[PDB]
Design an enzyme around this catalytic site. Structure first.
Site, PDB file in Angstrom:
ATOM      1  N   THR A 102      16.902 -20.950 -29.486  1.00 43.05           N
ATOM      2  CA  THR A 102      17.288 -19.883 -30.391  1.00 43.05           C
ATOM      3  C   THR A 102      18.592 -20.289 -31.052  1.00 43.05           C
ATOM      4  O   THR A 102      19.334 -21.114 -30.509  1.00 43.05           O
ATOM      5  CB  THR A 102      17.498 -18.544 -29.660  1.00 43.05           C
ATOM      6  OG1 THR A 102      18.386 -18.707 -28.548  1.00 43.05           O
ATOM      7  CG2 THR A 102      16.191 -17.943 -29.185  1.00 43.05           C
TER       8      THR A 102
ATOM      9  N   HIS B 144      13.296 -19.251 -18.557  1.00 37.54           N
ATOM     10  CA  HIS B 144      14.385 -20.208 -18.747  1.00 37.54           C
ATOM     11  C   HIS B 144      15.548 -19.781 -17.867  1.00 37.54           C
ATOM     12  O   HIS B 144      16.156 -18.733 -18.104  1.00 37.54           O
ATOM     13  CB  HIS B 144      14.830 -20.252 -20.202  1.00 37.54           C
ATOM     14  CG  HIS B 144      13.828 -20.889 -21.101  1.00 37.54           C
ATOM     15  ND1 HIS B 144      13.775 -20.645 -22.459  1.00 37.54           N
ATOM     16  CD2 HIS B 144      12.834 -21.766 -20.828  1.00 37.54           C
ATOM     17  CE1 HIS B 144      12.789 -21.354 -22.979  1.00 37.54           C
ATOM     18  NE2 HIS B 144      12.198 -22.035 -22.011  1.00 37.54           N
TER      19      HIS B 144
ATOM     20  N   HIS C  79      16.483 -10.347 -28.851  1.00 39.75           N
ATOM     21  CA  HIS C  79      15.526 -11.437 -28.902  1.00 39.75           C
ATOM     22  C   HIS C  79      14.823 -11.702 -27.580  1.00 39.75           C
ATOM     23  O   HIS C  79      13.760 -12.332 -27.585  1.00 39.75           O
ATOM     24  CB  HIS C  79      16.172 -12.731 -29.435  1.00 39.75           C
ATOM     25  CG  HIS C  79      17.480 -13.088 -28.792  1.00 39.75           C
ATOM     26  ND1 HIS C  79      17.581 -14.003 -27.767  1.00 39.75           N
ATOM     27  CD2 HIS C  79      18.745 -12.682 -29.057  1.00 39.75           C
ATOM     28  CE1 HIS C  79      18.849 -14.140 -27.420  1.00 39.75           C
ATOM     29  NE2 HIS C  79      19.576 -13.348 -28.187  1.00 39.75           N
TER      30      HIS C  79
ATOM     31  N   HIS D 112      16.111 -15.710 -18.744  1.00 37.36           N
ATOM     32  CA  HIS D 112      15.420 -14.866 -19.706  1.00 37.36           C
ATOM     33  C   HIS D 112      14.023 -15.436 -19.880  1.00 37.36           C
ATOM     34  O   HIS D 112      13.700 -16.511 -19.366  1.00 37.36           O
ATOM     35  CB  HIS D 112      16.130 -14.857 -21.065  1.00 37.36           C
ATOM     36  CG  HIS D 112      16.215 -16.208 -21.701  1.00 37.36           C
ATOM     37  ND1 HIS D 112      17.267 -17.067 -21.465  1.00 37.36           N
ATOM     38  CD2 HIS D 112      15.352 -16.875 -22.502  1.00 37.36           C
ATOM     39  CE1 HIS D 112      17.065 -18.192 -22.129  1.00 37.36           C
ATOM     40  NE2 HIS D 112      15.902 -18.104 -22.754  1.00 37.36           N
TER      41      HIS D 112
HETATM   42  C1  LIG Z   1      35.742 -18.247 -28.194  1.00 36.10           C
HETATM   43  C2  LIG Z   1      34.922 -17.548 -29.278  1.00 36.10           C
HETATM   44  C3  LIG Z   1      35.286 -18.045 -30.680  1.00 36.10           C
HETATM   45  N1  LIG Z   1      33.500 -17.738 -29.032  1.00 36.10           N
HETATM   46  C4  LIG Z   1      33.213 -19.142 -28.758  1.00 36.10           C
HETATM   47  C5  LIG Z   1      32.270 -19.259 -27.558  1.00 36.10           C
HETATM   48  O1  LIG Z   1      33.029 -19.334 -26.387  1.00 36.10           O
HETATM   49  C6  LIG Z   1      31.345 -18.038 -27.517  1.00 36.10           C
HETATM   50  O2  LIG Z   1      31.070 -17.702 -26.172  1.00 36.10           O
HETATM   51  C7  LIG Z   1      29.779 -18.065 -25.743  1.00 36.10           C
HETATM   52  C8  LIG Z   1      29.073 -19.050 -26.420  1.00 36.10           C
HETATM   53  C9  LIG Z   1      27.805 -19.408 -25.998  1.00 36.10           C
HETATM   54  C10 LIG Z   1      27.258 -18.775 -24.899  1.00 36.10           C
HETATM   55  C11 LIG Z   1      25.852 -19.194 -24.478  1.00 36.10           C
HETATM   56  O3  LIG Z   1      25.366 -18.875 -23.442  1.00 36.10           O
HETATM   57  N2  LIG Z   1      25.136 -20.012 -25.436  1.00 36.10           N
HETATM   58  C12 LIG Z   1      23.792 -20.444 -25.119  1.00 36.10           C
HETATM   59  C13 LIG Z   1      22.804 -19.365 -25.555  1.00 36.10           C
HETATM   60  C14 LIG Z   1      21.389 -19.868 -25.258  1.00 36.10           C
HETATM   61  C15 LIG Z   1      21.044 -20.242 -23.967  1.00 36.10           C
HETATM   62  C16 LIG Z   1      19.773 -20.698 -23.682  1.00 36.10           C
HETATM   63  C17 LIG Z   1      18.832 -20.808 -24.703  1.00 36.10           C
HETATM   64  S1  LIG Z   1      17.165 -21.415 -24.329  1.00 36.10           S
HETATM   65  N3  LIG Z   1      16.062 -20.355 -25.035  1.00 36.10           N
HETATM   66  O4  LIG Z   1      17.041 -22.725 -24.941  1.00 36.10           O
HETATM   67  O5  LIG Z   1      17.019 -21.515 -22.879  1.00 36.10           O
HETATM   68  C18 LIG Z   1      19.177 -20.451 -26.002  1.00 36.10           C
HETATM   69  C19 LIG Z   1      20.458 -19.979 -26.282  1.00 36.10           C
HETATM   70  C20 LIG Z   1      27.948 -17.786 -24.219  1.00 36.10           C
HETATM   71  C21 LIG Z   1      29.219 -17.435 -24.645  1.00 36.10           C
HETATM   72 ZN   LIG Z   2      14.848 -19.514 -23.735  1.00 35.51          ZN
END
Ligand SMILES: CC(C)NC[C@@H](O)COc1ccc(C(=O)NCCc2ccc(S(N)(=O)=O)cc2)cc1
Ligand SMILES: [Zn+2]
Length: 257
Positions: free
Chosen positions: A196, A116, A61, A91
Site C-alpha cells: 500500500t 501480513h 484500507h 493486518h
Molecule cells: C516523523 C514524521 C514526519 N513522520 C515520519 C514517520 O516517522 C511516520 O511514522 C510512521 C511511518 C511509517 C509507519 C509504518 O508502519 N509504515 C509501513 C506501513 C505498511 C506496513 C506494511 C504494509 S504490507 N501490506 O506490505 O504488509 C504496507 C504498509 C509507521 C509510522
Molecule cells: Zn499488507
C-alpha cells in the site's frame, strides 16, 4: 485519496507514488517451479511468547492489530534476515468472494485472503526510519483458504463489529498471534515493497508455503467492514488487495525442497 475503487485503485497509485512502477514492487506471483531451493537459508525464528497486543483499528484500507514495539518482546529473526525485527502490527487483505483476496499468488492461484505480520529492523531504531532502508522491514505473509475454522482468529473476528468504519479503534490486549500460524514454517523469500502507499521498497518478504484454514463465517465478518467512515455512503471493505507486479530482476528463493 488512494484506495481500491474504480477511480483511485491500484492502477492510479503511480500518480502520487511513482515508485509504483519501481524495480522491486510487491506483491508478485510465486512461480513454484522457478523458485530455487537455497540450502543456505536458515530456519525462521518466530519468537512471539511475550507479544503485547494493544489495539485493533479500522484504518480505511484494512483492519490492524497493533503491538508494543518499544522492546524485543515479539521478534522475527533467522531465515534470510540479518538481525532482529520487532513485530509492530498485523493486518489482512481479502476479497468479495472466496476465489480472490490474496496479494501474492502461487502459480497464479489466488487465495481468499492474506495475513501480513509486519516487523521492523531494530538497527534503525523506529519504524519510520526503517521504511527508508532497503532492509528495513520484514513482512511474514500467510495465505488463508476457506474450510474449517481457525479457533485462534475468533477473538479478532468477534470484535470487528465495534470497528466497522474508518477511524474506529478498540482495546485489544492479550491476543496471541501464535494462534494464526500454520504447522510448517517453510517459506519463499524475495526483496520487495510495501503493498500500500507509499509502496516503499524496504521489505524482505517471507511468504509461508502452508495456508491456514478459516471458516466461511469468519471471512464473512471481514466482508462486513466498511471503507467509509461513520455517516458516509456505505462501501463494503472488500477486495483490498493489490495485484501481482512485475518480477523484473529478482529471484524468489525457497527454504524447502
Ligand atoms: C516523523 C514524521 C514526519 N513522520 C515520519 C514517520 O516517522 C511516520 O511514522 C510512521 C511511518 C511509517 C509507519 C509504518 O508502519 N509504515 C509501513 C506501513 C505498511 C506496513 C506494511 C504494509 S504490507 N501490506 O506490505 O504488509 C504496507 C504498509 C509507521 C509510522
Ligand atoms: Zn499488507
Amino acid at each position: 485519496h488512494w484506495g481500491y475503487g474504480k477511480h483511485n485503485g491500484p492502477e492510479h497509485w503511480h500518480k502520487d507514488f511513482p515508485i509504483a512502477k519501481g524495480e522491486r514492487q510487491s506483491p508478485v506471483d510465486i512461480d513454484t517451479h522457478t523458485a530455487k531451493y537455497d540450502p543456505s537459508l536458515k530456519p525462521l525464528s518466530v519468537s512471539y511468547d511475550q507479544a503485547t497486543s494493544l489495539r485493533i483499528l479500522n484504518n480505511g484500507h484494512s483492519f490492524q492489530v497493533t503491538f508494543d514495539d518499544s522492546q524485543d518482546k515479539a521478534v522475527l529473526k533467522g531465515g534470510p534476515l540479518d538481525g532482529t525485527y520487532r513485530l509492530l502490527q498485523f493486518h489482512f487483505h481479502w476479497g468479495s468472494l472466496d476465489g480472490q483476496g490474496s496479494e501474492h499468488t502461487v502459480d497464479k492461484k489466488k487465495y481468499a485472503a492474506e495475513l501480513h505480520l509486519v516487523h521492523w529492523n531494530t538497527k534503525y531504531g523506529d519504524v519510520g526510519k526503517a521504511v527508508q532502508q532497503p532492509d528495513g522491514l520484514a513482512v511474514l505473509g500467510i495465505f488463508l483458504k476457506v474450510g474449517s475454522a481457525k479457533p485462534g482468529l475468533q477473538k479478532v473476528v468477534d470484535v470487528l463489529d465495534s470497528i466497522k468504519t474508518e477511524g474506529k479503534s478498540a482495546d485489544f490486549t492479550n491476543f496471541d498471534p501464535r494462534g494464526l500460524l500454520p504447522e510448517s514454517l517453510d517459506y519463499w523469500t524475495y526483496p520487495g515493497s510495501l503493498t500500500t502507499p507509499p509502496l516503499a521498497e524496504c521489505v524482505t518478504w517471507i511468504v509461508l508455503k502452508e495456508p491456514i484454514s478459516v471458516s466461511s463465517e469468519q471471512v464473512l465478518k471481514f466482508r462486513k467492514l466498511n471503507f467509509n467512515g461513520e455517516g458516509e455512503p456505505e462501501e463494503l471493505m472488500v477486495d483490498n488487495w493489490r495485484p501481482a507486479q512485475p518480477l523484473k530482476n529478482r529471484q524468489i528463493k525457497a527454504s524447502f525442497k
